[PDB]
Amino acid sequence: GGGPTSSEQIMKTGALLLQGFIQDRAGRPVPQDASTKKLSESLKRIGDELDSNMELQRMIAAVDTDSPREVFFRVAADMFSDGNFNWGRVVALFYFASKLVLKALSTKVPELIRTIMGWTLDFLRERLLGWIQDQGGWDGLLSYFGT
Amino acid sequence: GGGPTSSEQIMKTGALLLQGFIQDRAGRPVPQDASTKKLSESLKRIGDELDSNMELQRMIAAVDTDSPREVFFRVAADMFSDGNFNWGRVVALFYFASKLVLKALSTKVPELIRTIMGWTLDFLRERLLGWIQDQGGWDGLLSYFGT
Amino acid sequence: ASTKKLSECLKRIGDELDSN
Amino acid sequence: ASTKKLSECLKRIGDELDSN
């Protein structure tokens, strides 16, 4: 096999680190070796510090994420457009990738609540309404609760 | 207007209660009047007690939710197939609707992590890999962190 | 298949509730 | 439009980090 400098190892470890990092932040498990676990620890605590950077959250909050793929490539290109590289920017990019996951979920949610409310209210109208009327409507539920 | 027994009022209050209830459980705001707020309180605390019913969670966990619309109508029909109605079953149905939202989100997540990891790793290969090789790969990030 | 068992689980929760 | 400002925000976070 190749050592740490091979592109194959770079892609392999990159995926592990990236997956471990993102998943960690989303629950709020990926089997990995010791040095990779050590990097993941460093990653996790830095992520924690950025979660407390309140300006950044507002910064991340304001970008519209209806086209999240466009947003990612635009931010990434810009981060590295001056032709400089350093590990801090790479870290920052990872942090940003994990925030996109959460940001993206957050835009699905209202539509999901709407779809499910649709089912529930449809079922309620066609199947429970007659019975609910017999209770004198939702005030009957107040009685039930003893209010 | 109609009183509590009118179907129009039944549908109006039902939506408020349902929306308030589901949204409450998902953050872990819908303007509503006093008696409706009182019902929502009763709803919220009952929901809390069911969240602690550990058998129920396992029960909710085991159903496959790749077709969540099919699942909802099947559970709802069954809940009321014996031709009996009571407020407890209605409450149970609401609790179930809110769990579907969370359950449904949970199935989107891995695919979302996969899509975003795709972007990130693609960008990393084409734009950062050369520089990462110059550091001797990810071991350079260990150095950076002082490990 | 096992939607059946959560229905019953939710029916029995419903009735349990009315006892109070 | 304002992706521009989060990029800079993330660039400056990156550099801040290397100081340590």
mmCIF file of C-alpha atoms in Angstrom:
data_model
loop_
_atom_site.group_PDB
_atom_site.id
_atom_site.type_symbol
_atom_site.label_atom_id
_atom_site.label_comp_id
_atom_site.label_asym_id
_atom_site.label_seq_id
_atom_site.Cartn_x
_atom_site.Cartn_y
_atom_site.Cartn_z
ATOM 1 C CA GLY A 1 0.000 0.000 0.000
ATOM 2 C CA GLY A 2 0.748 3.711 -0.183
ATOM 3 C CA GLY A 3 1.874 5.804 2.736
ATOM 4 C CA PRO A 4 0.133 9.001 3.958
ATOM 5 C CA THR A 5 1.256 10.936 0.853
ATOM 6 C CA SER A 6 -0.491 8.682 -1.681
ATOM 7 C CA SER A 7 -3.694 10.146 -3.161
ATOM 8 C CA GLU A 8 -5.480 6.884 -2.441
ATOM 9 C CA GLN A 9 -4.631 7.198 1.299
ATOM 10 C CA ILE A 10 -5.464 10.879 1.204
ATOM 11 C CA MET A 11 -8.958 10.140 -0.155
ATOM 12 C CA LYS A 12 -9.501 7.217 2.242
ATOM 13 C CA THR A 13 -8.560 9.080 5.443
ATOM 14 C CA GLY A 14 -10.325 12.231 4.212
ATOM 15 C CA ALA A 15 -13.628 10.375 3.894
ATOM 16 C CA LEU A 16 -13.219 8.778 7.365
ATOM 17 C CA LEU A 17 -12.447 12.068 8.981
ATOM 18 C CA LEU A 18 -15.177 13.855 7.118
ATOM 19 C CA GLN A 19 -17.831 11.222 7.849
ATOM 20 C CA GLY A 20 -16.855 10.898 11.483
ATOM 21 C CA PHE A 21 -16.873 14.648 11.917
ATOM 22 C CA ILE A 22 -20.237 15.358 10.315
ATOM 23 C CA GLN A 23 -22.069 12.448 11.985
ATOM 24 C CA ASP A 24 -20.806 13.434 15.390
ATOM 25 C CA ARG A 25 -22.382 16.894 15.038
ATOM 26 C CA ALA A 26 -25.673 15.647 13.597
ATOM 27 C CA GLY A 27 -26.848 13.341 16.428
ATOM 28 C CA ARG A 28 -27.143 16.439 18.590
ATOM 29 C CA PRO A 29 -20.465 5.443 14.522
ATOM 30 C CA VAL A 30 -17.512 4.992 12.137
ATOM 31 C CA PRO A 31 -14.731 2.474 13.020
ATOM 32 C CA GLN A 32 -11.318 4.131 12.644
ATOM 33 C CA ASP A 33 -7.677 3.653 13.745
ATOM 34 C CA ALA A 34 -5.761 5.475 16.489
ATOM 35 C CA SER A 35 -4.048 8.371 14.715
ATOM 36 C CA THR A 36 -7.255 8.954 12.720
ATOM 37 C CA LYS A 37 -9.195 8.948 16.026
ATOM 38 C CA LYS A 38 -6.770 11.542 17.442
ATOM 39 C CA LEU A 39 -7.358 13.870 14.452
ATOM 40 C CA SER A 40 -11.104 13.387 14.841
ATOM 41 C CA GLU A 41 -10.823 14.491 18.487
ATOM 42 C CA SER A 42 -8.973 17.654 17.512
ATOM 43 C CA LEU A 43 -11.568 18.200 14.826
ATOM 44 C CA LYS A 44 -14.470 17.739 17.198
ATOM 45 C CA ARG A 45 -13.228 20.268 19.779
ATOM 46 C CA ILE A 46 -12.460 22.878 17.171
ATOM 47 C CA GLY A 47 -15.941 22.362 15.813
ATOM 48 C CA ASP A 48 -17.208 22.987 19.371
ATOM 49 C CA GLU A 49 -15.335 26.301 19.583
ATOM 50 C CA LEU A 50 -16.804 27.446 16.236
ATOM 51 C CA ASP A 51 -20.274 26.473 17.401
ATOM 52 C CA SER A 52 -19.723 29.185 20.039
ATOM 53 C CA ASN A 53 -18.550 31.745 17.480
ATOM 54 C CA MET A 54 -21.835 33.585 17.431
ATOM 55 C CA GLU A 55 -21.024 35.853 14.471
ATOM 56 C CA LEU A 56 -20.327 32.788 12.341
ATOM 57 C CA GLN A 57 -23.679 31.264 13.199
ATOM 58 C CA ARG A 58 -25.423 34.417 12.048
ATOM 59 C CA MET A 59 -23.178 34.390 9.001
ATOM 60 C CA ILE A 60 -24.150 30.758 8.295
ATOM 61 C CA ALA A 61 -27.839 31.521 9.102
ATOM 62 C CA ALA A 62 -28.205 34.300 6.498
ATOM 63 C CA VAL A 63 -27.205 32.440 3.329
ATOM 64 C CA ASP A 64 -30.181 31.016 1.447
ATOM 65 C CA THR A 65 -29.844 27.254 1.010
ATOM 66 C CA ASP A 66 -32.518 26.404 -1.517
ATOM 67 C CA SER A 67 -29.641 25.556 -3.851
ATOM 68 C CA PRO A 68 -27.251 24.020 -1.319
ATOM 69 C CA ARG A 69 -24.900 22.533 -3.945
ATOM 70 C CA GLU A 70 -24.363 26.000 -5.555
ATOM 71 C CA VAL A 71 -23.687 27.482 -2.159
ATOM 72 C CA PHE A 72 -21.082 24.904 -1.196
ATOM 73 C CA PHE A 73 -18.968 25.208 -4.354
ATOM 74 C CA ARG A 74 -19.153 28.938 -4.246
ATOM 75 C CA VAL A 75 -17.946 29.144 -0.649
ATOM 76 C CA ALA A 76 -15.250 26.529 -1.241
ATOM 77 C CA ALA A 77 -13.898 28.208 -4.399
ATOM 78 C CA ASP A 78 -13.802 31.576 -2.618
ATOM 79 C CA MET A 79 -12.085 30.173 0.462
ATOM 80 C CA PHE A 80 -9.280 29.048 -1.777
ATOM 81 C CA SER A 81 -9.319 31.630 -4.592
ATOM 82 C CA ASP A 82 -6.275 33.624 -3.385
ATOM 83 C CA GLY A 83 -4.109 30.551 -4.050
ATOM 84 C CA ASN A 84 -3.168 30.062 -0.451
ATOM 85 C CA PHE A 85 -3.693 26.894 1.477
ATOM 86 C CA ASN A 86 -3.362 26.078 5.104
ATOM 87 C CA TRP A 87 -4.772 23.440 7.433
ATOM 88 C CA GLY A 88 -7.044 25.955 9.156
ATOM 89 C CA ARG A 89 -8.968 26.609 5.905
ATOM 90 C CA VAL A 90 -9.343 22.862 5.371
ATOM 91 C CA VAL A 91 -10.712 22.504 8.885
ATOM 92 C CA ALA A 92 -13.026 25.468 8.225
ATOM 93 C CA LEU A 93 -14.277 23.750 5.074
ATOM 94 C CA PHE A 94 -15.117 20.569 7.009
ATOM 95 C CA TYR A 95 -16.955 22.576 9.631
ATOM 96 C CA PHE A 96 -18.883 24.225 6.838
ATOM 97 C CA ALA A 97 -19.805 20.926 5.204
ATOM 98 C CA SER A 98 -21.345 19.645 8.493
ATOM 99 C CA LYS A 99 -23.351 22.884 8.914
ATOM 100 C CA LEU A 100 -24.772 22.405 5.396
ATOM 101 C CA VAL A 101 -26.243 19.067 6.432
ATOM 102 C CA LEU A 102 -28.081 20.637 9.356
ATOM 103 C CA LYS A 103 -29.049 23.699 7.335
ATOM 104 C CA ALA A 104 -30.466 21.479 4.588
ATOM 105 C CA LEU A 105 -32.488 19.380 7.002
ATOM 106 C CA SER A 106 -33.939 22.542 8.487
ATOM 107 C CA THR A 107 -35.430 23.507 5.133
ATOM 108 C CA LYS A 108 -37.094 20.082 4.654
ATOM 109 C CA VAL A 109 -38.847 20.206 8.035
ATOM 110 C CA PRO A 110 -41.604 22.696 7.449
ATOM 111 C CA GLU A 111 -42.635 20.961 4.241
ATOM 112 C CA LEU A 112 -42.586 17.680 6.134
ATOM 113 C CA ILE A 113 -44.786 19.051 8.881
ATOM 114 C CA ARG A 114 -47.138 20.311 6.168
ATOM 115 C CA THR A 115 -47.326 16.964 4.366
ATOM 116 C CA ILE A 116 -47.995 15.023 7.580
ATOM 117 C CA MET A 117 -50.458 17.509 8.913
ATOM 118 C CA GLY A 118 -52.194 17.062 5.542
ATOM 119 C CA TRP A 119 -52.620 13.322 6.087
ATOM 120 C CA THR A 120 -53.722 13.697 9.659
ATOM 121 C CA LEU A 121 -56.315 16.434 9.021
ATOM 122 C CA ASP A 122 -57.637 14.551 5.990
ATOM 123 C CA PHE A 123 -58.099 11.429 8.094
ATOM 124 C CA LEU A 124 -59.598 13.519 10.878
ATOM 125 C CA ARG A 125 -62.183 15.170 8.545
ATOM 126 C CA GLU A 126 -63.316 11.994 6.900
ATOM 127 C CA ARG A 127 -63.181 9.653 9.874
ATOM 128 C CA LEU A 128 -63.264 11.409 13.291
ATOM 129 C CA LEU A 129 -65.139 14.672 12.644
ATOM 130 C CA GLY A 130 -68.605 13.167 13.175
ATOM 131 C CA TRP A 131 -67.507 11.781 16.495
ATOM 132 C CA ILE A 132 -65.756 15.020 17.457
ATOM 133 C CA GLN A 133 -69.000 16.908 16.706
ATOM 134 C CA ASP A 134 -70.848 14.583 19.005
ATOM 135 C CA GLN A 135 -68.474 15.771 21.843
ATOM 136 C CA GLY A 136 -69.326 19.397 21.010
ATOM 137 C CA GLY A 137 -65.985 19.765 19.264
ATOM 138 C CA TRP A 138 -62.580 20.260 20.865
ATOM 139 C CA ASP A 139 -64.109 21.748 24.001
ATOM 140 C CA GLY A 140 -64.925 18.136 24.824
ATOM 141 C CA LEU A 141 -61.219 17.486 25.006
ATOM 142 C CA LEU A 142 -61.025 20.294 27.631
ATOM 143 C CA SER A 143 -63.652 18.367 29.687
ATOM 144 C CA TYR A 144 -61.700 15.160 29.228
ATOM 145 C CA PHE A 145 -58.595 16.819 30.602
ATOM 146 C CA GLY A 146 -60.835 18.180 33.404
ATOM 147 C CA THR A 147 -60.403 21.858 32.464
ATOM 148 C CA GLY B 1 -69.361 32.230 13.252
ATOM 149 C CA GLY B 2 -69.870 28.647 14.376
ATOM 150 C CA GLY B 3 -69.359 27.426 17.901
ATOM 151 C CA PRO B 4 -67.050 24.532 18.918
ATOM 152 C CA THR B 5 -69.373 21.958 17.299
ATOM 153 C CA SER B 6 -69.165 23.391 13.770
ATOM 154 C CA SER B 7 -66.945 21.403 11.380
ATOM 155 C CA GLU B 8 -65.242 24.621 10.336
ATOM 156 C CA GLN B 9 -64.215 25.307 13.981
ATOM 157 C CA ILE B 10 -63.292 21.674 14.430
ATOM 158 C CA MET B 11 -60.899 21.826 11.455
ATOM 159 C CA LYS B 12 -59.481 25.215 12.499
ATOM 160 C CA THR B 13 -58.690 24.275 16.117
ATOM 161 C CA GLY B 14 -57.513 20.811 15.035
ATOM 162 C CA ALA B 15 -54.871 22.315 12.752
ATOM 163 C CA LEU B 16 -53.705 24.752 15.485
ATOM 164 C CA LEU B 17 -53.417 22.027 18.038
ATOM 165 C CA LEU B 18 -51.773 19.660 15.626
ATOM 166 C CA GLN B 19 -49.260 22.218 14.342
ATOM 167 C CA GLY B 20 -48.435 23.502 17.797
ATOM 168 C CA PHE B 21 -47.977 19.987 19.094
ATOM 169 C CA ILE B 22 -45.721 18.687 16.336
ATOM 170 C CA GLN B 23 -43.508 21.800 16.164
ATOM 171 C CA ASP B 24 -42.961 21.779 19.887
ATOM 172 C CA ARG B 25 -41.518 18.247 19.715
ATOM 173 C CA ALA B 26 -39.374 18.883 16.638
ATOM 174 C CA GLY B 27 -37.157 21.745 17.908
ATOM 175 C CA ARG B 28 -35.687 19.273 20.377
ATOM 176 C CA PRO B 29 -44.176 29.304 17.313
ATOM 177 C CA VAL B 30 -47.925 29.330 16.565
ATOM 178 C CA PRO B 31 -50.120 32.161 17.988
ATOM 179 C CA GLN B 32 -53.197 30.683 19.685
ATOM 180 C CA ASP B 33 -55.919 31.651 22.206
ATOM 181 C CA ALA B 34 -56.203 30.699 25.885
ATOM 182 C CA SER B 35 -58.360 27.566 25.911
ATOM 183 C CA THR B 36 -56.434 26.300 22.862
ATOM 184 C CA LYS B 37 -53.175 27.010 24.751
ATOM 185 C CA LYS B 38 -54.482 25.011 27.736
ATOM 186 C CA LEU B 39 -55.218 21.977 25.510
ATOM 187 C CA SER B 40 -51.767 22.303 23.961
ATOM 188 C CA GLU B 41 -50.235 22.166 27.458
ATOM 189 C CA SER B 42 -52.120 18.984 28.291
ATOM 190 C CA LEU B 43 -51.060 17.620 24.935
ATOM 191 C CA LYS B 44 -47.420 18.475 25.468
ATOM 192 C CA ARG B 45 -47.142 16.755 28.868
ATOM 193 C CA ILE B 46 -48.878 13.630 27.673
ATOM 194 C CA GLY B 47 -46.481 13.568 24.760
ATOM 195 C CA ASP B 48 -43.655 13.773 27.336
ATOM 196 C CA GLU B 49 -44.995 10.743 29.223
ATOM 197 C CA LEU B 50 -45.199 8.707 25.985
ATOM 198 C CA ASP B 51 -41.658 9.718 25.101
ATOM 199 C CA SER B 52 -40.733 7.792 28.272
ATOM 200 C CA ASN B 53 -42.804 4.754 27.295
ATOM 201 C CA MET B 54 -39.817 2.755 26.173
ATOM 202 C CA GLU B 55 -41.776 -0.125 24.614
ATOM 203 C CA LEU B 56 -43.583 2.348 22.370
ATOM 204 C CA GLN B 57 -40.325 3.822 21.143
ATOM 205 C CA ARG B 58 -39.128 0.377 20.138
ATOM 206 C CA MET B 59 -42.538 -0.216 18.604
ATOM 207 C CA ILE B 60 -42.243 3.054 16.641
ATOM 208 C CA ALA B 61 -38.567 2.285 15.785
ATOM 209 C CA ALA B 62 -39.289 -1.074 14.103
ATOM 210 C CA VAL B 63 -41.775 -0.007 11.423
ATOM 211 C CA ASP B 64 -40.127 0.710 8.077
ATOM 212 C CA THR B 65 -40.867 4.256 6.924
ATOM 213 C CA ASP B 66 -39.751 4.276 3.317
ATOM 214 C CA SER B 67 -43.434 4.694 2.477
ATOM 215 C CA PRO B 68 -44.450 6.963 5.359
ATOM 216 C CA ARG B 69 -47.847 7.892 3.866
ATOM 217 C CA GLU B 70 -48.855 4.174 3.621
ATOM 218 C CA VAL B 71 -47.763 3.635 7.185
ATOM 219 C CA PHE B 72 -49.770 6.532 8.578
ATOM 220 C CA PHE B 73 -53.094 5.582 6.971
ATOM 221 C CA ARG B 74 -52.643 1.994 7.909
ATOM 222 C CA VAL B 75 -52.006 2.771 11.573
ATOM 223 C CA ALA B 76 -54.825 5.320 11.682
ATOM 224 C CA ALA B 77 -57.391 2.995 10.061
ATOM 225 C CA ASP B 78 -56.425 0.192 12.458
ATOM 226 C CA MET B 79 -56.583 2.427 15.521
ATOM 227 C CA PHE B 80 -60.175 3.132 14.659
ATOM 228 C CA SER B 81 -61.297 -0.069 12.902
ATOM 229 C CA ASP B 82 -63.286 -1.500 15.851
ATOM 230 C CA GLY B 83 -65.700 1.440 15.535
ATOM 231 C CA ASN B 84 -64.872 2.872 18.903
ATOM 232 C CA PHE B 85 -63.706 6.382 19.497
ATOM 233 C CA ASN B 86 -62.348 8.098 22.520
ATOM 234 C CA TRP B 87 -60.181 11.140 23.172
ATOM 235 C CA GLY B 88 -57.212 8.997 24.194
ATOM 236 C CA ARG B 89 -57.001 7.430 20.702
ATOM 237 C CA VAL B 90 -57.160 10.893 19.136
ATOM 238 C CA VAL B 91 -54.327 12.030 21.381
ATOM 239 C CA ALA B 92 -52.411 8.855 20.478
ATOM 240 C CA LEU B 93 -52.896 9.647 16.792
ATOM 241 C CA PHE B 94 -51.450 13.151 17.242
ATOM 242 C CA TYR B 95 -48.474 11.751 19.102
ATOM 243 C CA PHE B 96 -47.981 9.336 16.244
ATOM 244 C CA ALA B 97 -48.145 12.056 13.603
ATOM 245 C CA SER B 98 -45.327 14.019 15.345
ATOM 246 C CA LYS B 99 -43.156 10.868 15.571
ATOM 247 C CA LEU B 100 -43.586 10.360 11.805
ATOM 248 C CA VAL B 101 -42.016 13.751 11.157
ATOM 249 C CA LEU B 102 -38.926 12.848 13.165
ATOM 250 C CA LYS B 103 -38.826 9.323 11.765
ATOM 251 C CA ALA B 104 -39.008 10.691 8.218
ATOM 252 C CA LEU B 105 -36.228 13.194 8.789
ATOM 253 C CA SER B 106 -34.052 10.418 10.157
ATOM 254 C CA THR B 107 -34.251 8.553 6.859
ATOM 255 C CA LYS B 108 -33.228 11.636 4.815
ATOM 256 C CA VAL B 109 -30.090 12.251 6.888
ATOM 257 C CA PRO B 110 -27.777 9.523 5.721
ATOM 258 C CA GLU B 111 -28.485 10.331 2.086
ATOM 259 C CA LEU B 112 -27.848 13.978 2.892
ATOM 260 C CA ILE B 113 -24.534 13.201 4.530
ATOM 261 C CA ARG B 114 -23.656 11.155 1.444
ATOM 262 C CA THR B 115 -24.547 13.926 -1.008
ATOM 263 C CA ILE B 116 -22.574 16.563 0.915
ATOM 264 C CA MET B 117 -19.621 14.339 1.510
ATOM 265 C CA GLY B 118 -19.702 13.817 -2.271
ATOM 266 C CA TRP B 119 -19.309 17.539 -2.945
ATOM 267 C CA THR B 120 -16.638 18.000 -0.342
ATOM 268 C CA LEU B 121 -14.479 15.032 -1.415
ATOM 269 C CA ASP B 122 -14.857 16.009 -5.073
ATOM 270 C CA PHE B 123 -13.661 19.523 -4.288
ATOM 271 C CA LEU B 124 -10.902 18.104 -2.111
ATOM 272 C CA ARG B 125 -9.615 15.761 -4.887
ATOM 273 C CA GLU B 126 -9.590 18.346 -7.605
ATOM 274 C CA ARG B 127 -8.462 21.361 -5.609
ATOM 275 C CA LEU B 128 -6.675 20.513 -2.315
ATOM 276 C CA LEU B 129 -5.120 17.080 -2.926
ATOM 277 C CA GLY B 130 -1.913 18.446 -4.479
ATOM 278 C CA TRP B 131 -1.411 20.686 -1.499
ATOM 279 C CA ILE B 132 -2.296 17.908 0.948
ATOM 280 C CA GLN B 133 0.329 15.690 -0.738
ATOM 281 C CA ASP B 134 2.887 18.394 -0.239
ATOM 282 C CA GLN B 135 2.203 18.107 3.576
ATOM 283 C CA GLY B 136 2.793 14.341 3.377
ATOM 284 C CA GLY B 137 -0.945 13.761 3.558
ATOM 285 C CA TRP B 138 -3.162 13.900 6.635
ATOM 286 C CA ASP B 139 -0.250 13.150 8.946
ATOM 287 C CA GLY B 140 0.626 16.793 8.356
ATOM 288 C CA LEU B 141 -2.594 17.702 10.087
ATOM 289 C CA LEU B 142 -1.356 15.657 13.104
ATOM 290 C CA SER B 143 1.800 17.867 13.130
ATOM 291 C CA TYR B 144 -0.338 20.975 12.855
ATOM 292 C CA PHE B 145 -2.323 19.913 15.891
ATOM 293 C CA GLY B 146 1.051 19.156 17.554
ATOM 294 C CA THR B 147 0.462 15.395 17.880
ATOM 295 C CA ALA C 1 -46.299 -6.279 8.605
ATOM 296 C CA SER C 2 -45.512 -4.782 12.017
ATOM 297 C CA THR C 3 -47.631 -1.660 11.634
ATOM 298 C CA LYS C 4 -50.281 -3.998 13.020
ATOM 299 C CA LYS C 5 -48.499 -4.170 16.392
ATOM 300 C CA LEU C 6 -47.934 -0.440 16.802
ATOM 301 C CA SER C 7 -51.617 0.174 16.064
ATOM 302 C CA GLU C 8 -52.595 -2.114 18.950
ATOM 303 C CA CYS C 9 -49.879 -0.523 21.009
ATOM 304 C CA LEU C 10 -51.468 2.907 20.277
ATOM 305 C CA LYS C 11 -55.071 1.652 20.787
ATOM 306 C CA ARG C 12 -54.124 0.344 24.238
ATOM 307 C CA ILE C 13 -52.329 3.577 25.041
ATOM 308 C CA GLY C 14 -55.459 5.460 24.038
ATOM 309 C CA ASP C 15 -57.719 3.465 26.348
ATOM 310 C CA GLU C 16 -55.201 3.528 29.203
ATOM 311 C CA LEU C 17 -55.422 7.297 28.968
ATOM 312 C CA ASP C 18 -59.221 7.525 29.382
ATOM 313 C CA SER C 19 -59.086 5.568 32.653
ATOM 314 C CA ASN C 20 -57.784 8.847 34.125
ATOM 315 C CA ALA D 1 -24.940 37.508 -2.749
ATOM 316 C CA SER D 2 -23.938 36.965 0.885
ATOM 317 C CA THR D 3 -22.052 33.718 0.347
ATOM 318 C CA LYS D 4 -19.217 36.155 -0.307
ATOM 319 C CA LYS D 5 -19.216 37.278 3.342
ATOM 320 C CA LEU D 6 -19.284 33.813 4.887
ATOM 321 C CA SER D 7 -16.347 32.801 2.688
ATOM 322 C CA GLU D 8 -14.277 35.671 4.102
ATOM 323 C CA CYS D 9 -15.603 34.821 7.518
ATOM 324 C CA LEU D 10 -14.328 31.224 7.009
ATOM 325 C CA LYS D 11 -10.995 32.335 5.438
ATOM 326 C CA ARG D 12 -10.294 34.522 8.478
ATOM 327 C CA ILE D 13 -11.293 31.713 10.808
ATOM 328 C CA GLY D 14 -8.886 29.444 8.962
ATOM 329 C CA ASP D 15 -5.938 31.806 9.359
ATOM 330 C CA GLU D 16 -6.813 32.619 12.974
ATOM 331 C CA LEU D 17 -6.489 28.905 13.614
ATOM 332 C CA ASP D 18 -2.934 28.546 12.239
ATOM 333 C CA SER D 19 -1.643 31.264 14.584
ATOM 334 C CA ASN D 20 -1.891 28.547 17.261
#
